[PDB]
Amino acid sequence: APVLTKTFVDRINQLNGGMWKAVYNGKMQNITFAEAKRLTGAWIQKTSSLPPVRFTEEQLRTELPESFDSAEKWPNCPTIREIADQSACRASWAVSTASVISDRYCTVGGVQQLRISAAHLLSCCKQCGGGCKGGFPGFAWRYYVEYGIASSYCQPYPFPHCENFDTPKCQATCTDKSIPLVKYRGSATYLLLHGEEDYKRELYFNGPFVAVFYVYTDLFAYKSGVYRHVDGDFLGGTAVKVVGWGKLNGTPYWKVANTWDTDWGMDGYLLILRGNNECNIEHLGFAGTPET
Template sequence: MGKRLPLLTTFGESTFKDLPKSFDPRTKWPNCKTLFEIRDQGSCGSCWAFGAAEAMSDRLCIHNPEAVKGTADIVRLSADDLLSCCSICGMGCNGGFPLEAWEFWKRKGLVSGGLYGTKGVCRAYEIPPCEHHVNGTRPPCSGDAKTPKCKHTCQPEYKVTYAKDKHFATKVYSIRKDEDAIKHELFTNGPVEADFEVYADFPSYKSGVYQHVSGALLGGHAIKLMGWGEENGVPYWLCANSWNTDWGDGGFFKILRGENHCGIESDINAGIPKV
């Protein structure tokens, strides 16, 4: 195991007694539009950067009272900036470490970004979208994209400097492997980054609560974990993937909750933005 972020100190059971039976952050913070969005990591093993940048973007809104009211612009933090410039995060498109991504947000900050080809932001994603395990109009993902180069400049038409466009965290931390502690964090501060073991029966997911039944281990995958509930008596975590909207349930999926299924509860990272 590598190093871990500081564990967030949570309180006793009284802290958790008011948690609802189900929770979807899109209902609690409807003006935080990033909660409704799904990104596409393209043919690059950058899930670690996407799960982080997505949850960080949500939190940037959730912790800004004006944005929550719908009276401030929504900022989408750049997965490209994180992927290309975080030298301690691992191997870029060949995989990386979620906890280091959160540390980078605190130490170096992230500029505005968004989907491939987005205008009006500092650093849009540079790797084009592709089809992740589904048939569609885009080319199938090959997984062989090169990590973009780190550039400390914004797109030519963007009028803010790279340094001035940076957004930072005030603190970053891990959440202990405890269902109620994770729920409390989601309910209080917004989505987190989680990772889990992907088996051969996961890529074909369409709906319902995913439970691994058969198939070989394909590798680790980082995602945004955002809510919880029950479906037909089966407890689940609600997650957003980064395989575009035509994968899974509109880009989202549910996975069994409370049993650390495929390791989903064992590496939860989060942080509080500076607003």
Template structure:
């Protein structure tokens, strides 16, 4: 595959608005179609599910973005990779691996998933001695080459961590961290954050004391074994794939697209892999909150580059 094109990830989000939702009949029809065709996964209907922030696919040829982070070509080999692997089991001292983030009413998956993977890796590479919840808020407010809540580049988000650093973050309106995530799930017209090199009132550290940087950011080779090796050695990675209507209805099993129209591209963090009923899968943490899917996680068919999921894989290493 020639890496001359990089996707502008026009992220997808799931949220609810009081009194408004996808009509039940539309959801019933979609779920019925899935159940008649899907052989490896189970669909369900979600109450008050509403699709928003879903734009047209943003595929833009751009060599400079493709080269925003280097390709990791000299990867250390692993003699034998396990059939099943879960980062949560290998690194149980890193609680962030169990956490599911909620990007709320903002197409910020590229930033939220990257911040989550960075949080995991910061803990993993310190042997659990250092815990820090990296956040997307400061990046979303200050990035000059993203579309904020309308999508952005995963590669440039990782490189921003190296160049400018990420600050700590607390959940929506929690008052925790240098900055709290500004967008909730109920679409109540939350104001967009302004770019400010200051932490919120009451936080004990200054911005410069809180911000932490990456030592490196890179792309992983676009093959199954290289991706597995990277996760096994260094922790979760961020991938992106094309999303169709049926994905919204996922409940359990190994997802494979079976029906519906394209809705855009989505970035997520892969924490492991396995085999279920003879079907190979990636184990993935979504950023739509714990009410979606299997408590926020999902399994996705592995080794087929299904809907482009193995084309662009991003990672990095922390600086202490």
């Protein structure tokens, strides 16, 4: 039932040539297949119909840096650096989107510290998915524009750290009933469809965005370095927040915030190979704009 064994981890480090380091004695040492499936479930609708991004001429003419990090461009935006823990609810579709929306209130929306509620999104957007069963990030972005989402102050995340439970009921009131519920809406949502240069230009001007990529079992052993899939079973798709790009010992990467708490990866982060649509990470990004 184990996803990881010592033999599997040895084979992984043989096939990856040392580009990244796989470990057996980490956070996922004993995770099973049924538990690993709790961490995917981000779904994509091949049609969509969301509009593509539109850059201005001044933005297109802007020369982009060799490395970039969102937290370095917006050092007064604390939510950019906060790593979430989705727990054992198939919720990355909501947690990543809510995390990006919170960052953009600071980078684009003129609000320095507004944390948006992933619990509200996953429990009250019934058209987005099946709550803790899974969901579409694209539908979550539409819901933000159409209906709006409560803040974490009003509806904090209810699931705890592990080593889980049902979709919470949708509530029109805050968990603390003395606190009134305020909904926050977007004005627009749009897609990044042309890969690496779209990603870089959107990050540079507007900050983090959501991308989905393919999850294989060798990812659960990732400790450090620049990840790329070399072996193991396909498990599905997961949604992550992209925050930057750079190079590590010659190898280009995207810097990505996972939702598996800070005891996985590089303090919660994943560095994934950049340049050749690794594990489909460059195929499609989601972003949007807060009302002002």
